[PDB]
Amino acid sequence: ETVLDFMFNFYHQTEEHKFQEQVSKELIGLVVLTKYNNKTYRVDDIDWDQNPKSTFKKADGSEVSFLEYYRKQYNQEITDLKQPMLVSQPKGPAMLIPELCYLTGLT
Amino acid sequence: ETVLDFMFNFYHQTEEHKFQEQVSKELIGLVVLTKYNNKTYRVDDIDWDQNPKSTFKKADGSEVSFLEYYRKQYNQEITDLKQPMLVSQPKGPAMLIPELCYLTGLT
RNA sequence: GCGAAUAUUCGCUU
RNA sequence: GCGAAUAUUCGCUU
């Protein structure tokens, strides 16, 4: 089950703000595993102001959308464009795609 | 965008029966393309009583779950277990997984 | 269109 | 862990 599957399955909520607060309450602190690289991340925040068509500056200096990044690097196609980004803060945060992350029992 | 992405994105509805009637109203008649085989199908019905853990009898006579079928035949992993099946009637209907089908402009 | 196998090289925090 | 390339064989309505 992906984080995206979960966001809609765990709690259903017609009021959008309430949906967003609750999902954020239900996800922040959990550990996800990306399906395309054997790394796990703590979900520190959910960025509702970003989506897969948003862009980031790569290690090397060039800019790419998350869409392009995941297709070129891992041949992972992201189908749902409306979904938020998950924020994981190391120690430049890693922004993860909910559709590409599996849930986990987590602290 | 997959059919699964669409089912949640197109119209939001807290009353479950209303969600189900509306999605069925919004999908029945549309043409989908499976992501893992270049075939298209008319959506004739949505089977809310089946899901990816349901089983069918293969051409050859053996029984498999949709989960097993899609993994063994196409290495397609189905992440969302709660989703309904799409029914396409030829001329034994083909049951399609919403998460594995792209939407299309359709009659 | 997705995929399997064997071999040989490769890419990968975001 | 997902994937790329070349070659050689393969599987595919559900």
Swiss-Prot record, chains A, B:
<comment type="function">
    <text>Endoribonuclease that plays a central role in postnatal germ cells by repressing transposable elements and preventing their mobilization, which is essential for the germline integrity. Acts via the piRNA metabolic process, which mediates the repression of transposable elements during meiosis by forming complexes composed of piRNAs and Piwi proteins and governs the methylation and subsequent repression of transposons.</text>
</comment>
<comment type="subunit">
    <text>Interacts (via Piwi domain) with DICER1, suggesting that it forms ribonucleoprotein RISC complexes; this interaction is regulated by HSP90AB1 activity. Interacts with MAEL, KIF17, PABPC1, PRMT5 and WDR77. Interacts (when methylated on arginine residues) with TDRD1, TDRKH/TDRD2, RNF17/TDRD4, TDRD6, TDRD7 and TDRD9. Interacts with CLOCK. Interacts with MOV10L1. Interacts with ANAPC10; interaction oly takes place following piRNA-binding. Interacts with RNF8; leading to sequester RNF8 in the cytoplasm. Interacts with TEX19.</text>
</comment>
<feature type="domain" description="PAZ">
    <location>
        <begin position="2"/>
        <end position="105"/>
    </location>
</feature>
<protein>
    <recommendedName>
        <fullName>Piwi-like protein 1</fullName>
    </recommendedName>
</protein>
<feature type="region of interest" description="Required for binding 2'-O-methylated 3'-end of piRNAs">
    <location>
        <begin position="40"/>
        <end position="42"/>
    </location>
</feature>
<feature type="site" description="Required for binding 2'-O-methylated 3'-end of piRNAs">
    <location>
        <position position="95"/>
    </location>
</feature>
<comment type="similarity">
    <text>Belongs to the argonaute family. Piwi subfamily.</text>
</comment>
